[PDB]
Amino acid sequence: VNCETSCVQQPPCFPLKIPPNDPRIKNQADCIPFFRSCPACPGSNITIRNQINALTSFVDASMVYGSEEPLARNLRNMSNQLGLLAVNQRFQDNGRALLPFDNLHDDPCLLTNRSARIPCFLAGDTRSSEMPELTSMHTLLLREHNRLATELKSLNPRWDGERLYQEARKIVGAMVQIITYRDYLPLVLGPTAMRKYLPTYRSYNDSVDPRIANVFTNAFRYGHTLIQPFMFRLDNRYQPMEPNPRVPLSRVFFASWRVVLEGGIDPILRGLMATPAKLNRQNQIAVDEIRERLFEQVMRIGLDLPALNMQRSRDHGLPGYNAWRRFCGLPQPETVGQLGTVLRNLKLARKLMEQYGTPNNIDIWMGGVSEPLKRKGRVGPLLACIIGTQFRKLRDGDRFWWENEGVFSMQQRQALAQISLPRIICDNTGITTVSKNNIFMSNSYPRDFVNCSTLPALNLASWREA
């Protein structure tokens, strides 16, 4: 059974059925395509089915370098001893590097515009081209790697390609860790959940299991509620870069041609900085660009991301809402009245009970994004617990965590504490005006912006071997 072209329910397909009076799909014989996640132990009549993580769980920039040795080598420039990552040999963005193209059998990116013939990009992770804004971030980090390897090559002439590569990769990895834990997570969790789940780092604990939990793969999709219906692009004075400043998201998915032929990554990065994210409200959960028209250009029918999330949690055998609440030490509402109190919203509680019958069966993503957001955070108690618990394990259970004694020198850690996403943008783009830290909060130009000239670059002097 071809899960993409058939609605027949047979391994490995688990198509989403269409309800009566669906707002878009009036034909109930249709379905939303769904392939079951690969089983860790195929065909077993003994093991309880589990799914696989194809990536390293560590915050180690594996989306830049790859999580398997063949790929990681192919992403590298082996033509010399500079320790660089390979760049696009057919295109540049205003004289700067693009990611190399990938070689896929059925390249989805080609389908987003037939005459442009721009394939998907090749990166450490397979999804770099899924949206141009994500592609911009991969490209930004690729450039920072090479910029770091170049400076390092000046400070340390004896260092060969392997040494430069590893040293540049080690700095980039720390950068992703610092941006994530210092600037991002506090704004996800809120101050209260941050202090509770991520207490001050002490040191590496080899008894802390660093694996991604199955539930996290669905819980962290809370980010789907932050998605705006457009890709916003702005010029160097931060105005709508015509003729298409606000492209519907359903025409940017896998649209790699837009990065290559529509102005590169600068217009996109400025759009991310100067545009508010969407706020998650209990009756404004996720936009139809992803609920109705997900990947519309690259397959027979538009998908529904929120619906895929719920079908995925069932595919993965994930427990319902109350089981996760109990796991987190949170009260488990049994009636519509109790659910209403937990949600501070009787109307939503009624809709949930009407769908599920009991809060015991609410799918984890649905229940998690339904909760009122913690003060100065963008998730409720349940997701804060799941996400905070995951990130503490990824930190404490990482032998190469940037703050672990032995990884960096005291002076190296002092230099790295000055890094920021805004500075990295200043170092690797044609943008000379960027967001004031914290970049995840700033969103209004020019009130929240500053010149790059005012931001101290990373000082690699303490990397000198002398």
Add this chain to the structure above:
Amino acid sequence: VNCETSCVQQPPCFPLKIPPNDPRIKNQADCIPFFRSCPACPGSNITIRNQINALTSFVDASMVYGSEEPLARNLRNMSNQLGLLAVNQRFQDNGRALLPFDNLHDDPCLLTNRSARIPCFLAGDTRSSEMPELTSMHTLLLREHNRLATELKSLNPRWDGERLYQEARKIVGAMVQIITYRDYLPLVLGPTAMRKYLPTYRSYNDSVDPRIANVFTNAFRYGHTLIQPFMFRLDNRYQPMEPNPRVPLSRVFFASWRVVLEGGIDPILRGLMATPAKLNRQNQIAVDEIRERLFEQVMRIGLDLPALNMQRSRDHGLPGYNAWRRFCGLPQPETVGQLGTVLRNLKLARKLMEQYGTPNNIDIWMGGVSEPLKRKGRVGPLLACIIGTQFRKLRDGDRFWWENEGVFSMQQRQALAQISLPRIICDNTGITTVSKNNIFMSNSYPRDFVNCSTLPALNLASWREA
């Protein structure tokens, strides 16, 4: 292949290597037989190897009834509607039931006395014949099931075979739970660890994982330290049953012929009640009957049970001593002096360090049984933690726990509270003098003994269907 007959280390064998100058196995290139436990996901290059529990984890007397349906049905007397368990059709024990014989391929029991031609017994669990004392307990519970079914049939004439079997099975499982948690576990753990790990039962909790933990399969082997080098047999006046009241254990393993042809289960049950168990001491851990001569009659050479326990823990990928101490919230000794303090025995700590080098590598069974025993208990802190944690999950996570609301009536629960192993022995054997409660402490005739006639029968009135 055959791991029993060669020393080649190839799947599925993991033969124990012999140290130089071994006092028994003089050829240092030979080995002790060992088959790796079957993997949960055979041949996988994704999963972390794990082992399988073939039995139900619940304390449900599955060693009597079987944990697989075909076996369960084969253990039942299907020739009528009395709901009984099948009994041996070739032999009786002074007019009382014996287990039926099994039909094995390389039947080990036949080997223990070639001329007697008595095969192994068939029971709910495959190991019933491993030692006659174990066989005696299996036989005792089979009789109790039949006795119960018979009385239940008089009480409830309309009850069919299925009903009688299920009601009798339910009582037998309850008896095993009560004897275990009321009489046995307190004497294993000591009062302090009993209160900590087994607080008063409140209710069935459907979120408590009842599965046996891998480490428990090894940690519960602490019992090997309790084994005496002989099987003791006594006559009805609790005097030595001649001509041989003391049989070396190396000649009773799989010796089912001794139950059939040497006096039945009464002399064996008497020997178990009026003989002390072996005390575990730090320089008297386990006897050579099991360390030099385990299964001597049915193997090419005698096996070493303590050594097998350690090889098994490695086969199972179990963490070392300190990781388990950490798991249990116990201090982790890092030096010989620190281990000396934890064990209250610097001599033993020194010996362990000469063998293992670091307390991080001490095998869980070895470290576990090396710890000084808790007050009025027979395990140290580490084993108390592992064992206590396991039994709490088996109790709290069992929907059929005897005290769980809806399993038995209040009046049935009152009646079940009066059961005891001494009474069960009185009901199903020719023994008329049994130990005073607690049977697990009482060990000296006649001091610790009383007449069966002073002990009331289990009152089944409340099982009468009105």
Add this chain to the structure above:
Amino acid sequence: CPEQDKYRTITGMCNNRRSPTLGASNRAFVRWLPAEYEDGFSLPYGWTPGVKRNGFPVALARAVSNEIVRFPTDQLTPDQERSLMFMQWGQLLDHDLDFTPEPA
């Protein structure tokens, strides 16, 4: 695992030396709670027509989406205190943490 190293392996292997595959690529996720499948070990809730979950009918994922997630785009509330870069770093970071393979 090498007694000593200088950098992360690409697969993540050997970060945890006592249990070398922890956090490494192409390994099963850890389970914080036991899985809940229709048959106990493999089939997803919603697979077999008429089979309920814990006493109740399984809601079609698309139905829950239509009833609870769907909203008029003109009602969208721009988050005054987060940039769209907040969303985008989230996706980028997720792709450093997990990718769950499916058959092609």
Add this chain to the structure above:
Amino acid sequence: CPEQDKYRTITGMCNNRRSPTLGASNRAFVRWLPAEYEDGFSLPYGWTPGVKRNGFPVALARAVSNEIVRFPTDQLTPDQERSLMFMQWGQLLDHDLDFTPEPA
């Protein structure tokens, strides 16, 4: 799993309604700590000549037994407060809880 029931199943199946294989027969043990294998996923410590465990050679189980467990049988100490029945119930109970199959 039936909506209601009055008796345990033989396999233990359906004892836990939400995850019906928990405590049931012929299922993998639960792990309270991640496994520790030579290669991280399958080979036991002591399998490969020269592979140390955490910086130290793997001690032969038989050597540990000989040097630490062995003791003079006439030194055996009778437990004044436990009967041999205490030993026997432990083995009987063990046989209610777990049996780890091996190939024949």
